[PDB]
Amino acid sequence: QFPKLREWIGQRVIKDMAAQGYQITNKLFESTVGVKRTDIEDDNLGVYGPL
Protein backbone atom coordinates (compact mmCIF):
# COMPACT_ATOMS: atom_id res chain seq x y z
CA GLN A 1 0.00 0.00 0.00
CA PHE A 2 0.88 3.71 -0.05
CA PRO A 3 3.02 5.17 2.80
CA LYS A 4 2.39 8.12 5.11
CA LEU A 5 1.93 11.67 3.90
CA ARG A 6 5.36 13.30 3.92
CA GLU A 7 6.17 16.89 4.92
CA TRP A 8 7.58 18.42 1.71
CA ILE A 9 5.88 19.31 -1.56
CA GLY A 10 9.03 21.21 -2.44
CA GLN A 11 11.51 18.70 -3.85
CA ARG A 12 8.96 15.91 -3.70
CA VAL A 13 10.39 12.42 -3.18
CA ILE A 14 9.11 9.63 -5.41
CA LYS A 15 8.55 6.11 -4.07
CA ASP A 16 7.73 2.63 -5.35
CA MET A 17 5.24 -0.11 -4.52
CA ALA A 18 6.54 -3.43 -3.20
CA ALA A 19 5.34 -6.53 -5.06
CA GLN A 20 4.92 -9.39 -2.59
CA GLY A 21 4.41 -13.05 -3.41
CA TYR A 22 3.75 -16.32 -1.62
CA GLN A 23 4.46 -19.73 -3.17
CA ILE A 24 3.11 -23.05 -1.90
CA THR A 25 2.99 -26.58 -3.32
CA ASN A 26 -0.22 -28.62 -3.11
CA LYS A 27 1.22 -32.07 -2.52
CA LEU A 28 -1.24 -34.95 -2.30
CA PHE A 29 -2.38 -36.91 0.75
CA GLU A 30 -3.47 -40.54 0.83
CA SER A 31 -4.17 -43.54 3.04
CA THR A 32 -5.44 -47.00 2.17
CA VAL A 33 -5.72 -50.56 3.47
CA GLY A 34 -5.65 -54.04 1.99
CA VAL A 35 -8.41 -56.65 2.25
CA LYS A 36 -9.22 -60.06 0.81
CA ARG A 37 -11.78 -60.54 -1.95
CA THR A 38 -13.36 -63.66 -0.45
CA ASP A 39 -13.59 -62.26 3.09
CA ILE A 40 -15.80 -59.32 2.10
CA GLU A 41 -18.17 -61.79 0.44
CA ASP A 42 -17.62 -64.25 3.31
CA ASP A 43 -19.01 -61.80 5.87
CA ASN A 44 -22.76 -61.91 6.51
CA LEU A 45 -22.75 -59.54 9.51
CA GLY A 46 -22.26 -56.32 7.54
CA VAL A 47 -18.80 -55.49 8.92
CA TYR A 48 -15.75 -55.67 6.64
CA GLY A 49 -17.45 -53.79 3.86
CA PRO A 50 -18.34 -50.55 5.59
CA LEU A 51 -14.77 -49.77 4.52
Binding site: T32, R37, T38
Partner: protein
Protein backbone atom coordinates in the same frame (compact mmCIF):
# COMPACT_ATOMS: atom_id res chain seq x y z
CA UNK B 1 0.03 -24.84 23.58
CA UNK B 2 0.10 -23.48 20.02
CA UNK B 3 -3.01 -21.28 20.19
CA UNK B 4 -3.85 -18.78 17.45
CA UNK B 5 -5.74 -15.60 18.23
CA UNK B 6 -7.32 -14.62 14.91
CA UNK B 7 -9.55 -11.75 13.73
CA UNK B 8 -10.98 -13.72 10.81
CA UNK B 9 -12.71 -10.47 9.82
CA UNK B 10 -10.40 -9.10 7.12
CA UNK B 11 -10.76 -10.07 3.46
CA UNK B 12 -8.78 -13.25 4.23
CA UNK B 13 -8.65 -15.68 7.15
CA UNK B 14 -5.58 -17.25 8.72
CA UNK B 15 -4.42 -20.71 7.67
CA UNK B 16 -6.62 -20.56 4.58
CA UNK B 17 -7.33 -23.96 3.03
CA UNK B 18 -6.87 -24.81 -0.65
CA UNK B 19 -9.30 -27.41 -2.02
CA UNK B 20 -7.64 -28.76 -5.17
CA UNK B 21 -9.26 -32.19 -5.61
CA UNK B 22 -12.24 -33.76 -3.80
CA UNK B 23 -12.14 -37.12 -2.01
CA UNK B 24 -12.42 -39.28 -5.14
CA UNK B 25 -12.54 -42.89 -3.96
CA UNK B 26 -9.77 -45.19 -5.17
CA UNK B 27 -10.46 -48.93 -5.22
CA UNK B 28 -8.70 -52.17 -6.15
CA UNK B 29 -11.43 -54.82 -5.89
CA UNK B 30 -11.03 -56.43 -9.32
CA UNK B 31 -8.60 -59.13 -10.55
CA UNK B 32 -7.52 -56.49 -13.11
CA UNK B 33 -4.49 -55.59 -10.99
CA UNK B 34 -1.32 -57.39 -9.93
CA UNK B 35 -2.20 -57.18 -6.23
CA UNK B 36 -4.57 -60.12 -6.71
CA UNK B 37 -1.98 -61.74 -8.99
CA UNK B 38 1.04 -61.57 -6.66
CA UNK B 39 -1.05 -61.95 -3.48
CA UNK B 40 -4.05 -63.84 -2.10
CA UNK B 41 -6.82 -61.74 -3.62
CA UNK B 42 -5.78 -58.57 -1.79
CA UNK B 43 -8.16 -55.74 -2.62
CA UNK B 44 -7.21 -52.18 -1.72
Amino acid sequence: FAPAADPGAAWYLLDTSRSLKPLIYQERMKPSFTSMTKEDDEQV
